[PDB]
Amino acid sequence: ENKNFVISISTAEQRRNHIIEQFTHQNIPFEFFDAFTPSDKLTDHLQRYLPNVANAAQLTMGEKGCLMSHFMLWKKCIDENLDYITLFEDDILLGENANKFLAEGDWLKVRFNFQEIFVLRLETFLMPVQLEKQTQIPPFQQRDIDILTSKHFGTAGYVISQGAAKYLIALFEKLTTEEIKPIDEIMFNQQINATDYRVYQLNPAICVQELQ
Amino acid sequence: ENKNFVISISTAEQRRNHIIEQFTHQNIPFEFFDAFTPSDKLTDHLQRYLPNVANAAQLTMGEKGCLMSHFMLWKKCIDENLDYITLFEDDILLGENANKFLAEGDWLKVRFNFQEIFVLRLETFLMPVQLEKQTQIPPFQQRDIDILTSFGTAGYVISQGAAKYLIALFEKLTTEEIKPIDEIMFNQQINATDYRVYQLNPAICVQEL
Numbered sequence: 001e002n003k004n005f006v007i008s009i010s011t012a013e014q015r016r017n018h019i020i021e022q023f024t025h026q027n028i029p030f031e032f033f034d035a036f037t038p039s040d041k042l043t044d045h046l047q048r049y050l051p052n053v054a055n056a057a058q059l060t061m062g063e064k065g066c067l068m069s070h071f072m073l074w075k076k077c078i079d080e081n082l083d084y085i086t087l088f089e090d091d092i093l094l095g096e097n098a099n100k101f102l103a104e105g106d107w108l109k110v111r112f113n114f115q116e117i118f119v120l121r122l123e124t125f126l127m128p129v130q131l132e133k134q135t136q137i138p139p140f141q142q143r144d145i146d147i148l149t150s151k152h153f154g155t156a157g158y159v160i161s162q163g164a165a166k167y168l169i170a171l172f173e174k175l176t177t178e179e180i181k182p183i184d185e186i187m188f189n190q191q192i193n194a195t196d197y198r199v200y201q202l203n204p205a206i207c208v209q210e211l212q
Numbered sequence: 213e214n215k216n217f218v219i220s221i222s223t224a225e226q227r228r229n230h231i232i233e234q235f236t237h238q239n240i241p242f243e244f245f246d247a248f249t250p251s252d253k254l255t256d257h258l259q260r261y262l263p264n265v266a267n268a269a270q271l272t273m274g275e276k277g278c279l280m281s282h283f284m285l286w287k288k289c290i291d292e293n294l295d296y297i298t299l300f301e302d303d304i305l306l307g308e309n310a311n312k313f314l315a316e317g318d319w320l321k322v323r324f325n326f327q328e329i330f331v332l333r334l335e336t337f338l339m340p341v342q343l344e345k346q347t348q349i350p351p352f353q354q355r356d357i358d359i360l361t362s363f364g365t366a367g368y369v370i371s372q373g374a375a376k377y378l379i380a381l382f383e384k385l386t387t388e389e390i391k392p393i394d395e396i397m398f399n400q401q402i403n404a405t406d407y408r409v410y411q412l413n414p415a416i417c418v419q420e421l
């Protein structure tokens with residue numbers, strides 16, 4: 001059964017073409033998942049499943065749509081009883097030997113217990129905090145005053161075990177409106193300390209986002 | 213009035229002596245703050261000021277004590293009406309020319325508004341999440357399976373504005389939102405509107421093991 005899903009706006013035909021080119025050349029099976037966008041469909045899904053998120057002013061409707069798309073795919077993993085599901089966003093660029101990882105799953109089956117709770121990142125690791133130089137505040141005694149700025153972890157390419165799909169669905173349902181944060185922050189920052197939940201990183205990675 | 217406080221367990225004589233040698237070597241005034249350790253004192257302070265932290269199973273009592281020590285120093289900043297306070301942990305090494313930064317404040321006064329909300333890190337910048345190798349799960353096609361694993365609160369200046377902000381922030385955090393103090397101050401909260409975290413580069417102190 002197919003394990004690879006690419007989140008893509010149903011009208012984003014040029015992005016879909018980019019995905020098709022890359023995946024078909026490497027003979028990697030996949031399906032598109034129609035992404036949630038600002039719409040009655042997204043609004044109704046938020047109210048049905050995540051009214052906490054519907055009420056969260058701290059997320060943009062785009063960020064809510066992104067969360068909803070991942071969340072519905074986590075649900076798909078559970079509903080179809082998949083050992084794992086592999087999720088992409090439609091701006092990823094695949095590295096050369098992606099087929100060995102994405103067209104076959106026996107390597108995962110040997111390495112992981114899917115009722116255990118893990119996410120394996122396939123995309124490049126991005127530092128969530130970086131130093132930026134600035135101009136307003138002058139240096140002192142030959143030391144610069146830099147600013148700490150936050151960067152989002154990508155959610156553009158990862159494997160999630162059925163265990164983790166269940167965990168993240170329950171987590172997002174249990175969060176209060178005030179506790180909601182963008183999906184990348186919950187998956188890859190906040191929850192890194194959580195006891196049974198483990199995040200792994202393929203290194204070197206096998207894909208990267210085409211944006212920034 | 214003194215601005216430099218070094219958080220240190222009252223019985224940690226060896227650490228205290230190392231701090232004394234380092235600060236006095238550069239004629240930097242400081243005072244020790246007796247760190248909270250597992251005790252009735254810590255328990256009662258948690259209940260009085262941070263009951264959501266008392267209930268947070270995800271922190272060790274040591275991590276709770278560390279948070280409590282910083283929190284009480286933020287309070288000290290407010291109570292003594294200090295423009296800023298400079299907080300250290302007791303396992304640090306001071307760099308050269310630290311006196312210009314730590315025994316004098318005019319450089320801060322001309323660069324910052326103390327009623328505004330900032331923290332200036334004095335300790336070396338460390339990546340708050342690292343890739344750790346592991347041995348149990350074999351690599352595949354020359355790619356390792358690493359674990360993502362978790363900044364340092366061993367050296368920073370905080371404005372009175374930020375002391376107020378952080379006291380209120382930590383009091384408002386839910387049990388679910390509680391994390392070790394360094395994860396809040398220097399990771400989670402970097403995404404926050406009026407809260408600005410700066411980094412001296414190169415830094416003027418570094419943490420020892």
Ligand SMILES: O=c1ccn([C@@H]2O[C@H](COP(=O)(O)OP(=O)(O)O)[C@@H](O)[C@H]2O)c(=O)[nH]1
Binds near residue numbers: 008009038062063089
């Ligand atoms: O309303 C939206 C917009 C985008 N996405 C998805 O989020 C991913 C990243 O989107 P993009 O790089 O275009 O940034 P965004 O538009 O989300 O800010 C892509 O898979 C999009 O299909 C979504 O689910 N809902």
Ligand SMILES: O=c1ccn([C@@H]2O[C@H](COP(=O)(O)OP(=O)(O)O)[C@@H](O)[C@H]2O)c(=O)[nH]1
Binds near residue numbers: 218221273
């Ligand atoms: O119960 C404790 C333990 C440590 N610390 C302080 O936290 C800093 C870091 O101490 P250490 O590196 O020993 O941390 P630990 O190993 O206790 O987690 C030092 O300034 C300690 O005095 C504290 O306030 N309470």
